[PDB]
Every structure is written in C-alpha cells, then in structure tokens.
Design a protein around this ligand. Structure first.
Ligand SMILES: [Ca+2]
Length: 99
C-alpha cells in the first residue's frame, strides 16, 4: 500500500530512491524491474544487466536516469536479495515524468 511517488521532467535527471534499503555487503542481488522489462539488475556474481547507457546503478543500489522519457514514466519495482539468495526488500515506486 505504501509504494511512493516522484515528480520529474522529460530529458532531465532523476534518481529512484528505494525506501528503507541499504546496498551493503548483506545485499547480493538488486533487480530493477518495470512492468514486463528490465532496467538494471546487479548480481554479486558480476555480469549485471544495464538496459542501456541511459541508466547507472548508484553505489547505494539506486537507479540513476540520464534523460527522462515516456518509457521512464510509470511504477518501478525493486527486489533486493541477500547473499543466501533470499528475498530482502520488495519495493514499488511511482515515477511521474512531466512532459
Ligand atoms: Ca539513491
């Protein structure tokens, strides 16, 4: 029920902040999924998945957008997993991009 909302502008930056989360050693897999597509998935076993240069996984397991766009407007979902491969934190935020 407590997802979250954010306001941004197309063509401008924006960082998707995960509520109550800390990308520390305890965190092994941080996936940034949106709808039926991937945006940025970081796995302790290196070899992550960056949708494109338009994104950058911050040091705190955050999402750094280069230039907002239509496809960027919507609800984002983060699934944080531990080193043991278990579910840690599952969040959902609302990223509204003003055109
Ligand atoms: Ca952040």
């Amino acid at each position: 029920r407590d997802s979250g909302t954010v306001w941004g502008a197309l063509g401008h930056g924006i960082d998707l902040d995960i509520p109550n989360f800390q990308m520390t050693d305890d965190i092994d897999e941080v996936r940034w999924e949106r709808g039926s597509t991937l945006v940025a998935e970081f796995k302790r076993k290196m070899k992550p998945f960056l949708k494109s240069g338009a994104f950058e996984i911050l040091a705190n397991g955050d999402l750094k957008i280069k230039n907002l766009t239509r496809d960027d407007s919507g609800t984002y979902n983060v699934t944080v997993y531990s080193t043991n491969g278990t579910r840690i934190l599952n969040k959902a935020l609302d990223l509204r991009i003003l055109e």
